[PDB]
Design a protein around this ligand. Structure first.
Ligand SMILES: CC(=O)N[C@@H]1[C@@H](O)[C@H](O[C@@H]2O[C@H](CO)[C@H](O)[C@H](O)[C@H]2O[C@@H]2O[C@@H](C)[C@@H](O)[C@@H](O)[C@@H]2O)[C@@H](CO)O[C@@H]1O
Ligand SMILES: [Cl-]
Ligand SMILES: [Cl-]
Ligand SMILES: [Cl-]
Lengths: 334, 332
């Protein structure tokens, strides 16, 4: 009750807990031997986030971007919306981007190409004059951070000097050209794919967008940072779920959302010292492993150089162990 | 004990409602009573509904997809199947996990229906799982009878159909006798103009499965719903305090409560006829909320239908089991 123990209970990793990027049911642990950073909808143990999102999945809303489509015919066109990072004046957490905007770099596309590994959400453009949707622009949109929009958007992984971009991955019924227009997109995303095949866990570390000051997660001895893997829909085979014959698609997040929520409500600085992990034991049908939580809010496992996904289907229960030195190897007994 | 099911964050900004997944900001008394089963659990670990305590996606692989006329551009796309056909759903075959428990509001021409549950998604190819990309739109979903020619609302799942109809024109309509539906499970409310409407759904719009217990007043204790601010199609930018009005959606339970009831059995916590009671401490007074064995919440507000604002709620404390015949304290 004064310790971090209650942040991670059995249900968080055995079917109830979802990840803090995709809001998908967590079903695996993904080690990241090469390290990574994440700030959006990520909290530390001192009540702080470096991102721009609250620990929830609602809607993405920005009232002042540029909306356009190419060419002289407005039917069945790709709709583009973009604004500058730092323009989210109505966001009380951070003005970097609208609450819920995904922390992934923009994958550009044009013509008839559907992008690969884009964060995609449903919604459209809306009318800055009155708040009404431009009903002919509803579609699935890729959202991400870029530089060089509108003519040549390219991915960027820093928010400084960035643009926030939304582009319909399929043709909207009728395009809209308005220099000032709003964006509205539901905050629960899917992964864009051009065919039926699953791709690697998404986002890969080098696709994650981070704000200045975001601490990095790197290996500490044999302890390696992890992401939490969930089953996420993909556009090329939207019906595919866990156990699909077309392959399983994973999305990854830096924290279980229940942990993020708990961290956002509390301050755990008096409970865990810098350089300590809080450790839990994960008990499987056969064997167990330890997970450690750092003061920066990253989770670790004692898996060393391994990049192999750990399946949680046989996870039985979680028990708190207590604070440990981060230099002490987390047990891996699977 | 049930005590930990309702803690302060559940009603002070973190907890969302179990129909719209909106942040709970008010308590809405229902003096006439109501029923709800979908994504609603009792204290005996069971639901009469067809949805798990989460908001993911609505997916059904075997419906009929159509649009009217010889021109496919900018048309209203219709999808329907029979209730009882959700074979892939381990909770209930009544409907796909996440399908909304609201009766269908018919519409035509260019008029947007009032008080419809609306979600984003489209039709997909039952043969390979690929989306019909030209059918993506905002769709009204609900239970009806008489589709495809004349869908009309029904509030019982028995003999019902599940219907999705785009409220705006799709880029290119699709006619397929067997086709899938895919719609994200977090909804918005349809309105025909910028004005907010009454809290949605009203009790007479809620669809229930046979056997669902009703929540009725017990003396001066009245069943409540949990109110959240929900987006509306007529003014999608509107949030709390909009000069075009504030739109509320309502649910029978806070989702965190639903989740907890789904994981454990609370049968031993309440003797017959009892509420589990919490005290809600506001800045200038307090009130009690009671939870019945059927999973419905009550307040001692009698005939009042006035929304209770939670902006001034400070903390929640568990009280314990109390007889339901005792008026719940209301001192605000
Ligand atoms: C062309 C015209 O007159 N449009 C107005 C529109 O400007 C109004 O918007 C509100 O304007 C005030 C300033 O006068 C504030 O900026 C409000 O925040 C703004 O409302 C918000 O945005 C609008 C677009 C709606 O989405 C509303 O629900 C939001 O609260 C509106 C509202 O008075 O009226 C006319 O459309
Ligand atoms: Cl925002
Ligand atoms: Cl039918
Ligand atoms: Cl196809």
């Amino acid at each position: 009750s004064i310790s971090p123990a209650d942040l991670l209970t059995t249900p968080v990793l055995t079917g109830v807990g979802t990840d803090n990027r995709w809001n998908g049911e967590i079903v695996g642990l993904q080690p990241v031997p090469g390290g990574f950073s994440t700030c959006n909808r990520h909290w530390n143990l001192n009540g702080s986030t470096f991102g721009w999102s609250s620990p929830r999945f609602a809607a993405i809303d920005h009232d002042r971007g540029n909306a356009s489509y190419p060419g002289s015919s407005s039917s069945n066109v790709l709709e583009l919306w973009y604004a500058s990072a730092g323009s989210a004046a109505d966001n009380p957490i951070s003005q970097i981007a609208p609450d819920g905007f995904p922390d992934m770099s923009f994958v550009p596309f044009s013509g008839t190409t559907v992008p690969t590994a884009g964060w995609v959400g449903f919604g459209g453009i809306w009318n800055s004059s009155n708040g009404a949707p431009f009903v002919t622009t509803v579609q699935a949109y890729e959202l991400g951070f870029a530089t060089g929009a509108p003519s040549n958007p390219q991915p960027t992984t820093t928010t400084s000097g960035a643009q926030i971009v939304a582009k319909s991955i399929y043709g909207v019924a009728t395009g809209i050209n308005q220099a000032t227009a709003g964006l509205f997109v539901m905050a629960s995303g899917v992964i864009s794919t051009p065919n039926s095949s699953a791709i690697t866990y998404t986002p890969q570390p080098n696709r994650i967008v981070n704000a200045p000051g975001t601490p990095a997660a790197a290996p500490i001895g044999k302890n390696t940072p992890i992401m939490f893997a969930s089953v996420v829909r993909r556009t090329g085979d939207i019906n595919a779920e866990a156990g699909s014959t077309n392959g399983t698609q994973y999305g990854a997040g830096s924290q279980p959302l229940p942990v993020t929520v708990g961290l956002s409500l509390n301050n755990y600085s008096s409970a865990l010292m810098p350089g300590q992990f809080f450790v839990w034991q994960l008990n499987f049908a056969s064997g167990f492993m330890e997970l450690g939580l750092s003061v920066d809010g990253y989770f670790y496992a004692g898996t060393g150089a391994s990049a192999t996904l750990i399946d949680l289907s046989e996870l039985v229960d979680i028990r708190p162990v207590g604070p440990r030195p981060s230099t002490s190897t987390l047990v891996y007994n699977l």
